[PDB]
Write a protein that binds this ligand. Structure first.
Ligand SMILES: CCCCCCCCCCCCCCCCCC(=O)OC[C@H](CO[C@@H]1O[C@H](CO[C@H]2O[C@H](CO)[C@H](O)[C@H](O)[C@H]2O)[C@H](O)[C@H](O)[C@H]1O)OC(=O)CCCCCCCCCCCCCCCCC
Ligand SMILES: CCCCCCCCCCCCCCCCCC(=O)OC[C@H](CO[C@@H]1O[C@H](CO[C@H]2O[C@H](CO)[C@H](O)[C@H](O)[C@H]2O)[C@H](O)[C@H](O)[C@H]1O)OC(=O)CCCCCCCCCCCCCCCCC
Ligand SMILES: CCCCCCCCCCCCCCCC(=O)OC[C@H](CO[C@@H]1O[C@H](CS(=O)(=O)O)[C@@H](O)[C@H](O)[C@H]1O)OC(=O)CCCCCCCCCCCCCCC
Ligand SMILES: CCCCCCCCCCCCCCCC(=O)OC[C@H](COP(=O)(O)OC[C@@H](O)CO)OC(=O)CCCCCCCCCCCCCCC
Ligand SMILES: CC1=C(/C=C/C(C)=C/C=C/C(C)=C/C=C/C=C(C)/C=C/C=C(C)/C=C/C2=C(C)CCCC2(C)C)C(C)(C)CCC1
Ligand code: SF4
Ligand code: SF4
Ligand code: SF4
Lengths: 55, 73, 365, 110, 200, 148, 189
């Protein structure tokens, strides 16, 4: 994947289910995902097999 | 063979049962159930801890009680 | 069997003078009872902590051992390592020996409680006197430590605790008197033998029901379970002046008094070393039980087990009723004591004497 | 009334140490410099600190014995200690149980 | 000198003494008796751990109101300079093996009262030697347990041969002053005052 | 308990960097940290999340900007390298130095190889990194943890 | 005079019945399981609203000095220089102290280019306070996930339980966020 695209988390075990995020950077096989909920910008990291690309 | 040797063997078996084989199964069952037991069974477990306490003082620093790790995909 | 007689015969076969051989035999049980008393104290501290956790729906001390059982041992090993601090006053030896005067007689009174026919230390005539007159000494050490405390609030709290402690000695003696009248004796061996003659129908709890409650209330007031005298008029009553060593000594002394009271209440009223089925019927049903020790050892273990479950039941009931009944003031406690336990104890002794003089068939005669 | 003001290094007690205790007396001010193991000291800088304390207690004359003036004297003493540390003199020691830079961190001039 | 604030420069052991030192450190790690001192909402955050939701008791820490049977003090809240000699005396009346955990943003530094303030103390490290700091306004109780874990990791660093550090040197000095005697401060005298019932 | 001997010191003197697995419920690395001081090593506590860059803080000097409130102007403080200044006025016996990182979980694997090369470049200080651990005390080579 | 004695006896038997009811509810309280959590074995799940550390990026920054005026203490500093080759300013260093931080997340809201971010870190314990001036390359690291750690046990809070649970410790199902997400409502209705 590339930093700057919209992805979606599809893991049924985590609390964030089908949330669109913004990829910030890629290192060590971990993806930083920035969520946009309300007026605060949270950044929760995930894995490379957890997310799916959404155009 | 005599009766005093049988009395000494009974004393040794009683000391071995008081020190080794009872606190092992007590330590097993105590964290085996630990939640489903009622108040009378909790009092029975606390009495089982209370009674064989010289066995617990010798079996305390050797045993380990820590949770097992899980697997992730 | 007789371990003392066999040890005496072995020392005579080795060759001795029958005096220095018999002199040194007593310190081994005299230290064994002390070390099992410290074992019971380390049991009772963990038991009180875990039961206070289980009442308020939480878990006690963990991550110290298997389940935290070494935490009373760790506390007793840490509190003797702390720096002994002293306030800005005089009489340092008095401040040191005050808690020693407190700790000596309550520890000394271990020669009274039995565990069987032979598993006891001293049963000469008057073990209840050696309990009461030795337990009535600790107010002197409390007032001595309050005078050596050099404070305006801790001295007043020590005076209030001493006035609370000395008031509950008279019904504590009258409830002993009400049982000693029926048992026609002051030793615990005859008292437990008159209960172990029959089974449940010879217990003193069903014969004197008011005196047992009076004795239990007096014991709970004496061992400072319901009276909180440790918010005591500024912060605490007889605290906030010692170090870890003197506080550890006071803590172990309070737990020794609690264990000794929980044993003595059951011994004087319910009865350790007893069974609901009489042992003579079981001995006649099994075989011949007069010289064979294979059943006698198991009977002694069963008597020790009965005494231990009675002591554990009384300890659990006391530490369950500590957080069950709410806290009452010390003035209301002294008022309820002096207005309840003395008149009903006196009329209980009167009706006990009347029932003994009326029908001397089921009583002690 | 025992008037005193101490933070971590200076102790200005308005009494007199007889053996191990103090008594209330408004005629003697006892100074204790660095009671905790935080800075290593010598005999010349401690004498300069004592001379600055004598100068500061000679400056404050004709005033009432209050906590504010004694705390101001202790603050000027700690400011003198900080300027003596910044002057190029004795500092921290690597022998304590805890190492917390309360006055400043070692930096580079150039 | 080109270096500001310089730092001055400052073996076989036995196995039985090492095991005795491990036992002596394990006893202090297992007991760890704290002191509850709080003047603000940080005291409420500390009391939320004593309840049956986080179980702060299970590590061995029991609540004591006595500043004499506690080998660890927990300062917490906004500290006024009028409370600073009170905190100094409460720290000095404790026994010698004592530890300091400072919880809060206004405790370890000035906090929010560092811009325009004249009464709040900007840092408790100017008063008592802090061993483990704890940032947060207010911090999580899991962060307080993490500070407890770091304090337990720091206690085991002590030695039984280098035990000669828990003391205070004398360095006494005696000088005279020329201050004026002050009138005493009010002690009581609120209700039965001569200017209260009688109107002037 | 377990009477531990002198084995972490030999594994620290043989390799250049070690990684020990401790239980996070309490403290057990303090025994080895005290045995290192008993063997004649000077310990240095340091936190691994707050370090900035390892090169500019361990080899060269850095510039710290203190948080001003608008009262003071923008000032810069010249901080020297920490382990170099700790190695300058170090030795009472001249045996060795160790560097202990407490929370080594919030780190990346890129600077670990640079730290393992830096502790092998200058043979006077060691690197000890702590991992959150799995139920037992075990030691592993840091270069093997980097390569695998 | 006898009516006061009967009233005292009624008060005594009522107090005895209250003591018995207190013993009954105390014995009732021993039946329920403990509802506490272990640390660091059962860590709580941070919500999407619970804030933490401030994460700073060195790429999507223009050094406009807007969030400094929003902060009441002005803790993020901007070390900007003026370049004559270009026409704008560039950022050299970025430092922020965390010991005086309020952690209210007010500078993150007033940011059009979302240069600041919320990071789920609360485990900050340091033996010294002089290292709290965090660098931008130190704030640009990866946060610690509570899910990927195999030694901890994940457990949600009270408001993250399906259809209403009062305990929230077992959680045998995999459902969360009790209600409905606003995506299937547009499909069905
Ligand atoms: C919640 C609270 C929890 C509480 C705590 C619970 C957990 C702890 C529970 C532990 C159990 C509690 C303690 C048990 C009760 C106390 C028993 C005791 O004190 O009891 C004291 C006993 C003594 O009691 C009895 O003592 C008798 C002597 O009594 C005489 O002396 C007594 C005074 O001591 C009385 O006066 C009595 O009337 C009088 O007859 C005999 O010795 C009996 O055998 C003995 O049972 O002490 C002994 O056990 C003797 C001491 C050890 C000596 C070792 C024996 C000597 C070695 C012999 C080896 C022989 C080797 C040669 C072999 C030959 C080979 C051919
Ligand atoms: C690494 C460290 C290793 C440490 C090594 C230490 C090893 C040695 C210590 C081990 C102790 C534990 C072993 C248990 C021994 C129990 C022997 C026993 O009770 O021996 C019994 C004898 C019986 O005594 C004799 O008993 C006779 C028969 O009387 C008995 O029977 C009569 C029947 O009417 C009466 O009831 C009378 O009261 C009652 O005592 C007479 O009383 C005699 O006077 C008397 O000599 O007691 C005696 O001599 C006195 C014996 C004192 C033992 C007290 C210990 C407490 C008992 C253990 C707790 C019970 C646990 C059992 C666990 C089993 C669980 C299923
Ligand atoms: C050849 C065999 C020899 C056997 C010798 C038996 C000696 C028993 C006593 C042990 C003494 C050494 C303990 C060292 C302490 C340590 O570092 O932590 C060891 C363990 C760590 O946990 C434990 O640690 C273990 C490993 S780990 O550390 O968790 O990783 C883990 O397995 C375990 O689950 C956990 O409980 O701590 C303990 O729980 C052990 C407690 C031992 C204390 C005994 C008290 C002594 C009382 C008598 C005192 C006399 C002196 C009186 C002075 C006036
Ligand atoms: C199997 C054995 C079970 C034994 C359990 C008994 C131990 C309980 C003792 C109580 C300790 C606390 C005393 C505090 C008591 C307390 O604080 O309140 C005492 C309360 C005081 O009330 P007041 O302050 O209103 O009274 C004084 C004022 O009236 C001034 O005018 O009333 C009493 O005086 C009556 C006492 C009755 C006490 C009854 C106790 C027994 C209740 C349980 C009966 C159980 C029967 C069981 C049958 C199976
Ligand atoms: C043979 C034998 C044995 C056995 C044992 C047993 C069998 C025991 C058991 C028993 C038990 C197990 C006991 C215990 C008990 C306790 C309890 C249980 C208590 C508590 C309770 C309470 C205190 C309460 C109260 C009350 C009241 C009074 C009123 C009403 C209400 C109530 C009920 C709450 C052994 C193995 C040891 C060994 C040796 C031999
Ligand atoms: S740090 Fe925050 S929570 Fe703590 S005392 Fe200060 S204002 Fe209150
Ligand atoms: S973080 Fe945002 S407000 Fe602050 S200087 Fe960068 S772009 Fe401007
Ligand atoms: S959270 Fe508040 S105090 Fe912290 S940097 Fe942002 S604006 Fe300043």
């Amino acid at each position: 994947i590339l930093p700057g695209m919209t992805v979606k988390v599809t893991n049924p075990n985590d609390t964030y289910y089908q949330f669109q995020g913004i990829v910030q950077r890629i290192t060590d096989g971990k993806v930083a995902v920035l969520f946009e909920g309300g007026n605060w910008d949270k950044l929760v990291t995930f894995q490379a097999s957890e997310l799916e690309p959404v155009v | 063979v005599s009766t005093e040797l049988l009395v000494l063997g009974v004393y040794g078996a009683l000391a071995g049962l008081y020190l080794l084989v009872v606190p092992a199964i007590v330590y097993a069952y105590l964290n085996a159930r630990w939640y489903v037991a009622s108040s009378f069974e909790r009092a029975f477990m606390y009495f089982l801890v209370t009674f064989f306490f010289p066995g617990l003082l010798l079996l305390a620093p050797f045993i380990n009680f820590r949770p097992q790790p899980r697997s992730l995909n | 069997i007789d371990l003392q007689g066999q040890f005496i015969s072995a020392l005579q076969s080795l060759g001795l003078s029958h005096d220095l051989a018999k002199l040194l035999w007593l310190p081994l049980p005299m230290l064994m009872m002390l070390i099992v008393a410290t074992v019971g104290v380390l049991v009772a501290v963990w038991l009180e902590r875990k039961i206070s956790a289980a009442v308020q729906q939480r878990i006690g001390p963990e991550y110290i051992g298997p389940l935290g059982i070494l935490a009373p041992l760790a506390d007793g090993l840490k509190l003797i390592f702390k720096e002994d601090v002293l306030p800005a006053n005089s009489d340092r030896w008095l401040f040191t020996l005050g808690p020693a005067v407190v700790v000596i007689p309550v520890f000394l009174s271990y020669i009274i409680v039995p565990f069987g026919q032979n598993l006891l230390i001293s049963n000469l005539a008057m073990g209840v006197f050696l309990w009461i007159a030795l337990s009535s000494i600790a107010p002197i050490g409390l007032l001595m430590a309050g005078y050596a405390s050099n404070n305006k609030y801790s001295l007043l709290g020590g005076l209030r605790a001493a006035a609370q402690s000395i008031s509950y000695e008279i019904p504590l003696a009258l409830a002993v008197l009400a049982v000693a009248m029926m048992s026609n004796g002051l030793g615990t061996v005859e008292i437990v033998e008159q209960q172990s003659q029959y089974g449940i129908l010879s217990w003193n709890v069903w014969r004197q029901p008011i005196g047992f409650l009076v004795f239990w209330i007096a014991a709970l007031a004496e061992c400072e379970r319901l009276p909180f005298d440790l918010e005591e008029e500024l912060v605490a009553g007889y605290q906030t002046e010692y170090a870890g060593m003197k506080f550890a000594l006071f803590y172990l002394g309070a737990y020794v008094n609690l264990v000794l009271s929980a044993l003595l209440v059951s011994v004087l009223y319910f009865g350790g070393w007893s069974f609901p089925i009489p042992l003579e019927t079981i001995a006649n049903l099994l075989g011949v039980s007069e010289t064979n020790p294979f059943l006698q050892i198991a009977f002694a273990v069963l008597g020790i087990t009965m005494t231990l479950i009675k002591a554990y039941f009384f300890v659990f009931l006391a530490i369950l009723l500590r957080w069950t009944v709410p806290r009452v003031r010390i003035d209301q406690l002294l008022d309820l004591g002096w207005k309840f336990l003395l008149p009903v104890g006196l009329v209980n002794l009167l009706l006990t004497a009347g029932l003994k003089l009326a029908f001397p068939v089921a009583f002690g005669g | 009334m025992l008037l005193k003001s101490t933070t971590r290094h200076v102790h200005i007690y308005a009494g007199h140490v007889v053996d191990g205790e103090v008594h209330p007396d408004t005629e003697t001010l006892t100074l204790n410099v660095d009671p905790d193991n935080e800075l290593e000291w010598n005999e010349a800088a401690l004498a300069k600190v004592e001379a600055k304390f004598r100068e500061l207690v000679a400056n404050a004359a004709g005033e009432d014995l209050t906590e504010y003036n004694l705390r101001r004297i202790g603050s000027d003493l700690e400011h003198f200690i900080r300027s003596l540390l910044m002057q190029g003199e004795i500092g921290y020691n690597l022998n304590s149980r805890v190492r917390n830079y309360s006055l400043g961190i070692p930096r580079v001039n150039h | 000198p080109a270096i500001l604030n310089p730092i001055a420069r400052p073996l076989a052991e036995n196995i039985i003494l090492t095991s005795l030192n491990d036992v002596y450190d394990w006893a202090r790690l297992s007991s760890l008796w704290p002191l509850m001192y709080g003047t603000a909402c940080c005291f409420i955050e500390f009391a939320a751990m004593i309840g049956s939701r986080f179980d702060f008791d299970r590590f061995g820490l029991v609540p004591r109101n006595s500043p004499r049977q506690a080998d660890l003090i927990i300062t917490s809240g906004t500290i006024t300079m009028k409370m600073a000699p009170a905190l100094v005396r409460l720290y000095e009346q404790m026994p010698s093996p004592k530890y300091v955990i400072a919880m809060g943003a206004c405790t370890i530094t000035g906090g929010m009262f560092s811009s325009d303030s004249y009464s709040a103390v900007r840092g408790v490290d100017k008063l008592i030697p802090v061993d483990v700091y704890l940032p947060g306004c207010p911090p999580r109780p899991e962060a307080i347990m993490d500070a407890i874990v770091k304090l337990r990791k720091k206690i085991a660093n002590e030695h039984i041969n280098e035990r000669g550090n828990l003391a205070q040197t004398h360095r006494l000095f005696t000088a005279k002053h020329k201050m004026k005697p002050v009138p005493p401060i009010l002690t009581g005298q609120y209700l039965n005052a001569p200017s209260r019932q009688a109107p002037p | 308990g377990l009477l531990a001997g002198y084995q972490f010191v030999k594994d620290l003197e043989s390799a250049g960097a070690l990684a020990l697995f401790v239980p996070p419920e309490g403290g057990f690395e303090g025994r080895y940290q005290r045995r290192l001081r008993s063997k004649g090593y000077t310990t240095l506590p340091m936190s691994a999340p707050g370090l900035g860059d390892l090169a500019a803080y361990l080899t060269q000097e850095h510039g710290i900007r203190p948080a001003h409130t608008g009262k003071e102007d923008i000032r810069v403080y010249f901080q020297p390298p920490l382990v170099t200044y700790h190695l300058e006025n170090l030795p009472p016996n001249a045996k060795g130095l160790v560097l202990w990182l407490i929370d080594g979980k919030r780190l990346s694997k890129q600077e670990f190889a640079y730290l393992a090369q830096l502790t092998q470049t200058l043979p006077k200080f060691k690197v000890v990194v702590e991992v959150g651990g799995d139920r037992v005390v075990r030691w592993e080579p840091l270069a093997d943890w980097v390569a695998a | 005079f006898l009516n006061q004695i009967t009233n005292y006896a009624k008060e005594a038997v009522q107090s005895a019945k209250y003591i018995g009811q207190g013993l009954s509810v105390t014995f009732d309280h021993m039946r329920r399981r403990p509802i506490t959590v272990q640390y660091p074995y059962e860590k709580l799940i941070p919500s999407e609203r619970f804030r933490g550390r401030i994460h700073f990026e060195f790429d999507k920054c223009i050094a406009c000095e807007v969030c400094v005026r929003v902060c009441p203490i002005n803790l993020p500093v901007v070390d900007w220089v003026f370049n004559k080759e270009l026409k704008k300013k560039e950022l050299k260093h970025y430092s922020i102290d965390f010991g005086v931080c309020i952690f209210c997340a007010n500078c993150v809201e007033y940011c059009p280019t979302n240069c600041l971010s919320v990071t789920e870190e609360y485990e900050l314990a340091t033996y010294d306070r002089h290292e709290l001036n965090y660098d931008s390359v130190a704030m640009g690291r990866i946060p610690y996930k509570v899910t990927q750690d195999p030694m901890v046990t994940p457990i949600r809070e009270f408001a993250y339980l399906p259809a209403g649970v009062m305990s929230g410790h077992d959680l045998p199902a995999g459902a969360q966020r009790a209600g409905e997400r606003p995506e299937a409502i547009a499909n069905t209705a």
